[PDB]
Amino acid sequence: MREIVHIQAGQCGNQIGAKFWEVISDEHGIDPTGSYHGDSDLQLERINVYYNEAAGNKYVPRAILVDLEPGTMDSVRSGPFGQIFRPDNFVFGQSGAGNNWAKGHYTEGAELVDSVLDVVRKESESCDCLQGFQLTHSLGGGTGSGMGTLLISKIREEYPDRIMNTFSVVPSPKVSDTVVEPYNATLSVHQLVENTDETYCIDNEALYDICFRTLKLTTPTYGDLNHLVSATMSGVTTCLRFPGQLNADLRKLAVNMVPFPRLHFFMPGFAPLTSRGSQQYRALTVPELTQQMFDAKNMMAACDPRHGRYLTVAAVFRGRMSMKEVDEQMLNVQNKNSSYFVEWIPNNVKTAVCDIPPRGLKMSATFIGNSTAIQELFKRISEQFTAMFRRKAFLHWYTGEGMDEMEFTEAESNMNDLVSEYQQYQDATA
Amino acid sequence: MRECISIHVGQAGVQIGNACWELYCLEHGIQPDGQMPSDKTDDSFNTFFSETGAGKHVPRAVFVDLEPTVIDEVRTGTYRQLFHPEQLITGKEDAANNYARGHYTIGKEIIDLVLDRIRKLADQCTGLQGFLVFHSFGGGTGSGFTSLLMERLSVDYGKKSKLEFSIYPAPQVSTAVVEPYNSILTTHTTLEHSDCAFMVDNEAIYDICRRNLDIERPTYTNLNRLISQIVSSITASLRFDGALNVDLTEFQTNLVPYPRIHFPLATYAPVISAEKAYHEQLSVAEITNACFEPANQMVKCDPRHGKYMACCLLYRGDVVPKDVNAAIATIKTKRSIQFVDWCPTGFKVGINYQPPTVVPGGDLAKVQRAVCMLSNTTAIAEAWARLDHKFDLMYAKRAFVHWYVGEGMEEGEFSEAREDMAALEKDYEEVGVD
Ligand SMILES: Nc1nc2c(ncn2[C@@H]2O[C@H](COP(=O)(O)CP(=O)(O)OP(=O)(O)O)[C@@H](O)[C@H]2O)c(=O)[nH]1
Ligand SMILES: Nc1nc2c(ncn2[C@@H]2O[C@H](COP(=O)(O)OP(=O)(O)OP(=O)(O)O)[C@@H](O)[C@H]2O)c(=O)[nH]1
């Protein structure tokens, strides 16, 4: 439980993870070559959790990039921090499933699982103690979702003793109107719920609508969505990147947050909302950000926590926080809205402090809460699957690989049972 | 002669151990290297400290933990040479706020080294007396590893007394929401092995530091300094040549009248912050009256509902027996204190003429005289009622039970733990009626 290894898959996942590591190096004072260039010693206090010490005090990401389309390779070396990742971690295919889960999970999956398992073992026995595994991938994309699901299955059957976090990207019709999105999304979320411990549902629908309504981005490209996902996924990982008494490890995250094995998807929250093109935002006060968490726009799930009820919530504060005022404010917020907090889980509201603020701003706070409110996200995925499935269309691509529709039926059944679990846990009371 | 060994399980245990050992070496004129500055030639401190040929006095304590952060923080801290490397134990796998992981999955591969260290420490201890345990209820390690170690030590030694200074979790300084499970499970497991345990409610101590010390936020450091002061006040009679010497066996005899009721409530006075340029010294009667309000104990409970099975006083400072007896007589006039008819009289006298030192840099202020009130009352029944009410609300929906299930143990263990706590509460209300 000492070192985290990052697993990267899919063009969306590859881009978001690459520029996320860019941001992490920027806020840890790591140059584009790998040498430390910060000022405070807090940056290097637990730098080994993500980076690996190299020759000449160089630091190298423990990120393994996989993608069948080689365009992401040029894209990842095109931007900054392109050369920090070692070439052996750039194990890429050639074919490209192209929005087909089965094509990227059966045909070319076997040709890549061997190499990726070999390399991940290389750093696993090259690391003092493995915290677990984290995955950044897109559920809609056939290549990325298939490769990520195969990696999840192989690592789960190979490392059952280690936690497996996943930063899944839920497809949205607005960002991309691919027809086969619901099928791959449902199969991938089934594979997730079978073999994951923490899952952050980074749905692009919420990203697009909050970019349009708040950041005034008429056509938010991949850059803006990647900016928001990097911000939120750095905010959540502040727990693992800096010393703190709350959420030290992935196992501590699982113990504190998820009460049930089949209920482990997460709602990523973080305030304020800063765009790439704007940097002169004022310093928001603690009350503003504490009451900013309830807003659905500030929530990075296409959701509404008013509909659901909070099971467990984790909050970390970054800046020159008045810590006593922080505790009083969070206690008052919990008291004022006790209806949405499960009364059968006492003291489920937790707060944390981080001295180092994200670069660019000073006032920030993340809201990683586990609530049943994503029940409506699963409603939307279910209605998409049914509306694209009640005519029994588009199944011929999948049946061409030899697999039948029985997997689709069982995945839908398990997802519906998961929705029923959400409803039952929401309606439960003392 | 009557040597004792202190065990510090978990992060909370090792930190409170560091603080208390710092205070001990300050009080007994023990400079950090371990040598005696013009003081080698009282022999009471030899029970807690082992003297080598070189003249340094390494404490007879062990530091065990399943994460390597606090352990090598102590190693790299101000006391590199104070503790030898063998009584420092690390681990690459932590329980991570899980009693099951710290008891079955991860505890088993470290308890062997722990027993080896304990045996090595006790080898030079001729008159072995008892074991001191410091840990946390809320923490997964401080519960599971503590329980497993207690079972192993009961298997090995047995009749030797065992004392626990266990951290009682509080929401203000809580780290995990699954803490009631761990606390209930560990106190159920160690109930038949802990001859006497001292419950320290972190909410009460948090409030004490907030109000008495006038601190905006009681951090972990101030809390640890205060609790180390409390533990030192409790164990000074064992570490000093007091007139009415009380040892661990006498602790069991006095503060534990019933074998299943072994949670004495401590109350030490006074607590004056370092500022104000004056401590405003309180008289013996004043400090005696200051140890009875419901805002000074170590556990947030009302003693009025409780009944005194046994109460003891330990004056430690510039006190005279005449004023001590006068204060005791004045206190006895109060009807707010009542003793069970089975007990003859819940009162005891402990006098330590040595002045009580204060750790340098601490927010506490030097006081000429002080006293800690140790009583076994059914006021702790309210705290236990809060704890098992949280447990009952927590277990009604099988929340987080699967984490415990995955580590071997099942819901059955929760069942006998809950019924054992229920039986403990009926024991409280049985002894609470005369
Ligand atoms: N939030 C983001 N969503 C993205 C991004 N790129 C794509 N997507 C969304 O993910 C979906 C596309 O899935 P992918 O890009 O992962 C296709 P995949 O990588 O699996 O195969 P290839 O790209 O052909 O190599 C679609 O809904 C897109 O709108 C991105 O940079 N950010
Ligand atoms: N009084 C006091 N309590 C503490 C201290 N440190 C931790 N605690 C309590 O201990 C609880 C958590 O246990 P941990 O400190 O994590 O100890 P642990 O059981 O070894 O768990 P890990 O350190 O994660 O392995 C917290 O909820 C605190 O209330 C301390 O220094 N003083």
DSSP B52-76: -TTS-EEESEEEE-SSHHHHHHHHH
Using DSSP, how many helices (H) and how many strands (E) does chain B show? 14, 12
Q: Is the CATH code 3.30.70.100 the one for domain B265-379?
A: no
- Rounded to whole angstroms, how far apart are CA atoms B352 and B350? 7
Atom of ligand 1 nearest to the CA of A98: 24
Q: What is the dihedral of CA A122, A123, A126, A130, to 10 degrees?
A: -130
- For residue B162, give the H/E element and its range: strand B161-168
- Rounded to whole angstroms, how far apart are CA atoms A364 and B330? 57
| CA–centroid distance for B262 within its chain | 12
A99: left (phi over 0), alpha (psi -120 to 50) or beta: left
Pair B21, B170: CB distance under 8 Å:
no
A170: left (phi over 0), alpha (psi -120 to 50) or beta: beta
Second-level CATH architecture of B380-434:
Orthogonal Bundle (1.10)
Q: What is the dihedral of CA B169, B171, B173, B176, to 10 degrees?
A: 70
Give me the catalytic one of B250, B382, B413, B425: B250
Strand partners for A36: A30
> How many CB atoms are located within 10 Å of the residue A9 CB?
31
Pair A309, A292: CB distance under 8 Å:
no
Six-digit token string for A29: 């004072």
Kindly state whether B90 is in contact with chain A, defined as any CB-CB distance less than 8 angstroms.
Answer: no
Six-digit token string for B405: 């299930």
Indicate the length of chain B as a whole number. 434
Topology annotation, domain A260-373: 60s Ribosomal Protein L30; Chain: A; (3.30.1330)
- For residue A367, give the H/E element and its range: strand A364-371
E strand segments, A157-252: 163-170, 198-200, 202-203
Six-digit token string for A301: 């799930």
Q: What phi and psi, each to the nearest 5 degrees, are found at residue A138?
A: -105, 130
Using DSSP, how many helices (H) and how many strands (E) does chain A show? 14, 12
Q: Catalytic residue at B3?
A: no
Write the burial class of residue B102 (CB in 10 Å: 0-12 exposed, 13-18 middle, 19+ buried): buried
Q: Is the CATH code 3.40.50.1440 the one for domain B1-264?
A: yes
- Rounded to whole angstroms, how far apart are CA atoms A297 and A306? 13
Q: A143: annotated binding-site residue?
A: yes
- Pick the closest to residue A243 from A45, A53, A59, A48 (CA basis): A45
Give residue limits of the domains in chain A: 2-259, 260-373, 374-428
Method by which the model was determined? cryo-EM
Enumerate the residues of chain B whose CB falls inside 8 A of the CB of residue A245.
175, 220
Angle at B266 between CA B265 and CA B268, to 5 degrees: 155
- Pick the closest to residue B239 from B15, B9, B60 (CA basis): B60
In the block, tokens 């609470």 appear at B432
- Rounded to whole angstroms, how far apart are CA atoms A313 and A234? 17
> How many CB atoms are located within 10 Å of the residue A219 CB?
8
DSSP string, B331-346: HHT-TT--B-TTSS--
Pair B222, B273: CB distance under 8 Å:
no
Residues whose CB falls within 8 Å of the CB of residue A396, separated by 6 or more in sequence, listed in order: none
Write the burial class of residue B224 (CB in 10 Å: 0-12 exposed, 13-18 middle, 19+ buried): buried
Pair A276, A231: CB distance under 8 Å:
no
- Rounded to whole angstroms, how far apart are CA atoms A429 and A212? 38
Strand partners for A174: none
- Rounded to whole angstroms, how far apart are CA atoms A140 and A148? 12
- Pick the closest to residue A389 from A409, A374, A363, A416 (CA basis): A409
Task: Say if strands B308-316 and B371-377 run parallel, antiparallel, or are unpaired.
Answer: antiparallel
Take atom 14 of ligand 2 and give the residue whose Cα is closest. Answer: B139
Enumerate the residues of chain B whose CB falls inside 8 A of the CB of residue A346.
177, 180, 390, 393-394
Nearest C-alpha in B relative to A430: B393
Six-digit token string for A335: 């008291």
Domains A260-373 and A374-428 share a fold: no
Give residue limits of the domains in chain B: 1-264, 265-379, 380-434
Enumerate the residues of chain A whose CB falls inside 8 A of the CB of residue B393.
343-346, 430
Contact B92 A2 (CB under 8 A): yes
- Rounded to whole angstroms, how far apart are CA atoms B182 and B168? 11
Helices (H), A248-305: 250-257, 286-290
- Rounded to whole angstroms, how far apart are CA atoms B152 and B142? 15
Take atom 5 of ligand 1 and give the residue whose Cα is closest. Answer: A12
Indicate the length of chain A as a whole number. 430
Pair A95, A108: CB distance under 8 Å:
yes
How far does the centroid of ligand 2 lie from the alpha carbon of residue B108, in Å?
21
- Pick the closest to residue B57 from B30, B19, B29 (CA basis): B30
Kindly state whether B394 is in contact with chain A, defined as any CB-CB distance less than 8 angstroms.
Answer: yes
Among the partner residues A255, A345, A428, nearest to B97 by beta-carbon distance: A255
Topology annotation, domain A374-428: Helix Hairpins (1.10.287)
Q: A1, A48, A262, A335: which to substitute to probe chain B, counting the most B Cβ within 10 Å?
A: A1
Angstrom resolution of this structure: 3.5
Topology annotation, domain A2-259: Rossmann fold (3.40.50)
Peptide bond connecting A61 to the previous residue in cis, omega within 30 degrees of 0? no
Strand partners for B313: B373
Among the partner residues B93, B390, B403, nearest to A346 by beta-carbon distance: B390
Write the burial class of residue B280 (CB in 10 Å: 0-12 exposed, 13-18 middle, 19+ buried): exposed
DSSP string, A404-425: -SHHHHHHHHHHHHHHHHHHHH
Q: A347, A425, A429: which to substitute to probe chain B, counting the most B Cβ within 10 Å?
A: A347
Q: What phi and psi, each to the nearest 5 degrees, are found at residue A320?
A: -80, 65
